[PDB]
A paper describes a structure:
RNA guanine-7 methyltransferase ([name]) catalyses the transfer of a methyl group from S-adenosylmethionine (SAM) to the cap intermediate to form the cap m7G(5′)ppp(X) and the by-product S-adenosylhomocysteine (SAH). [name] was identified based on homology to the yeast and viral homologues and in vitro activity. [name] has an activating co-factor [name]-activating miniprotein (RAM) clamped at the interface of the catalytic domain and the modular lobe 416–456. Consequently, [name] is a target of interest in cancers and immune disorders.
[name]–Sinefungin–GMP-PnP, [name]–SAH–DDD1060606 and [name]–SAH–[name] co-complexes were solved, respectively, at 2.5, 2.0 and 2.4 Å in space group P21. The two inhibitors (DDD1060606 and [name]) identified in the screening campaign were successfully co-crystallised with [name] in the presence of SAH. In the presented structure, the pyrazolo-pyridine interacts with Y289 via two aromatic H-bonds, while the fluoro-benzene is buried in a hydrophobic pocket made by the residues including the main chain R173, as well as the side chains N176 and Y467. In comparison, the MIFs calculated for [name] suggest that the fluoro-phenyl moiety is responsible for the ligand binding via the interaction with a small pocket (S3) of high hydrophobicity. This interaction, by displacement of disorganised water molecules, is likely to be responsible for the significant gain in net enthalpic change ΔΔH measured for [name]. However, a significant gain in net enthalpic change ΔΔH of −1.9 kcal/mol was measured for [name] in comparison with DDD1060606, suggesting that the interaction of [name] with [name]-RAM is more enthalpy driven and might result in more selective leads with fewer absorption, distribution, metabolism, excretion and toxicity issues than DDD1060606. We report the structure of two small molecule inhibitors of [name] as result of a diversity-driven hit discovery campaign. These molecules behave biochemically as uncompetitive inhibitors with respect to both cap and SAM despite the structural biology data leading to an expectation of competitive inhibition with cap. The biophysical data resolve this puzzle by demonstrating that the compounds require the presence of the enzymatic product, SAH, in [name] to bind efficiently.
Author numbering:
A (entry chain B): 170 to 246, 252 to 419, 456 to 476
B (entry chain A): 167 to 415, 418 to 419, 456 to 476
């Protein structure tokens, strides 16, 4: 519960930074693509951003319905929203938008990207889906496990495994970290245990250039927290959310991750 | 200096590597063994090839002054009484990240059983087209079943020492590494300076070895193994020949091991 809340604060400040930048740029028709939305934990964040149109997509059809339902519920207590079930690493989302020439101001992709580094075609496909329809000046923002921190911990271990009572990471073998299909197990004890894939961030950065994007920043969770905490509204939100200090086991689990922000060039 | 001791330790590491794949080549075929020493320098492995009893060697390096020194060292070797069987050699000055070596061989159709690239291939990661071209020169003319072997800095260990560093610099009295910015490690062009006290002050580029691995597939190569300098040493010491050899050439100082431990060895095999 406490980790889920900490990560929402991270996502809130990240989305909020770039929602603000879009609002200084655009005058109307703010449109967002939430690639890998899950059950919809960011719907509230997009409503607070006063955006105009949301596309929500995930590979789990059950998650897409729950996300749709949560939207309908909050509509009836707002942006227009679309809900598409699809593998964004194998399908073109352009094939499924109500309007196949719509463009986006932000693609947000939270804890989703690394599942596409199963293979070259899949990672390229998810990037296309996240950046191809970005308007000039648009943003591709997200969160994903920091490959360096995962390799560092795996080396320093004895087993192909490290973790604690919250999380366990088991690698399929050691010393072999292919650009694609480097598989490992992320055991969220006991929510989910999902196959994940390593993302060498310099690879992702170079790949995004195919879609005319440039790095805005790449920040470990630590860096992101330390910089974003100095802001006042960010600190206000942290207290208003019930958040103080992470426990050591929770810090270890969440320091695995980094945040990234790219921007569509002209 | 104690550069003398590092050189002799590095020569052991290269002997053990060269030897493993020479013996693999010697068995897969009966015949003449032909070798590409890419970035040969002054010819510090010429003796390793003479003990390997190979039949044809090609030495190439971007530095013409070093190529001539390597040729000069080869001709002195053949003035000895124990060089009846010594390989024949040709010496070419060329930028192997820019020029096609195929158009400079005496025989433009010749083929290699081994391309040996020791402490060279990281200079080519200046750009993609240079890393690609050095790999073409190293692997395209390899016979099927041939080998691409070498040594190069372990980028994971450079970045670990950098991140952990207090400034953009780390080293000791033997070496110093200075990057240009922390956090920004591009696939190509990641420049850092490498100063080996008294020996050499050169710019180098980071090689993400997984990227090197993938790019080598384009020339139909497959990884045989990659081992850090430590990992390689501990496995190879177990064999008595390797160890007897290590002692015929003491143990390593602290600041010396810190300097050699940045490196990894690799071996690729050309597929059929
Ligand atoms: N190939 C793929 N295409 C689209 N979504 C995928 C996917 N692979 C995994 N996912 C989705 O990515 C999600 C990861 S959990 C992240 C959920 C949400 N964005 C949040 O931050 O709370 C899961 O819902 C999973 O179904
Ligand atoms: N682009 C390039 N093409 C060919 N050789 C290069 C090169 N860039 C650097 N080199 C050579 O690589 C050498 C690295 S020093 C290594 C020397 C030798 N291989 C040995 O192990 O003893 C230098 O002599 C340098 O001239
Ligand atoms: O929300 C986060 C952030 C986070 C939370 C706690 C941590 F300890 C570290 C990170 N996630 C990263 C880890 C797995 C999370 C998750 N829950 N359910 C899933 N189903 C899937 O199919 C794929 C992923 C998940 C998604
Ligand atoms: O032999 C090794 C291995 C090694 C030696 C000592 C160590 F402490 C650890 C490793 N080298 C790596 C370091 C630079 C060496 C070198 N000497 N002269 C050069 N000229 C150039 O143009 C480029 C590189 C060099 C080559």
């Amino acid at each position: 519960f406490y980790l889920r809340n900490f990560n929402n604060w991270m996502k809130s400040v990240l989305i909020g930074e770039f929602l603000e930048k879009v609002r200084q740029k655009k005058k109307r028709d703010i449109t967002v693509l939430d690639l890998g939305c899950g059950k919809g934990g960011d719907l509230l964040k997009w409503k607070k951003g006063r955006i105009n149109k949301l596309v929500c997509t995930d590979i789990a059809d059950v998650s897409v319905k729950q996300c749709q339902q949560r939207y309908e519920d909050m509509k009836n207590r707002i942006f227009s929203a679309e809900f598409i079930t699809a593998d964004s690493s194998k399908e073109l989302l352009i094939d499924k938008f109500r309007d196949p020439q719509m463009c986006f101001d932000i693609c947000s992709c939270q804890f989703v990207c690394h599942y596409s580094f199963e293979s070259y075609e899949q990672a390229d496909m998810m990037l296309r889906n996240a950046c191809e329809r970005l308007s000039p000046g648009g943003y591709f923002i997200g969160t994903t496990p920091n490959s360096f921190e995962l390799i560092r911990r795996l080396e320093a271990s004895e087993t192909e495994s490290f973790g604690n009572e919250i999380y366990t990471v088991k690698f399929q073998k050691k010393g072999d970290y292919p650009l694609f299909g480097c598989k490992y197990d992320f055991n969220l004890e006991g929510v989910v245990d999902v196959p994940e894939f390593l993302v060498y961030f310099p690879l992702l950065n170079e790949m995004a250039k195919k879609y005319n994007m440039k790095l805005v920043y790449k920040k470990t969770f630590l860096e992101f927290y330390e910089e974003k905490i100095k802001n006042n509204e960010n600190k206000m939100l942290l207290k208003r959310m019930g958040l103080g200090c992470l426990s050591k086991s929770e810090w270890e689990a969440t320091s695995i991750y980094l945040v990234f922000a790219f921007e569509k060039q002209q």
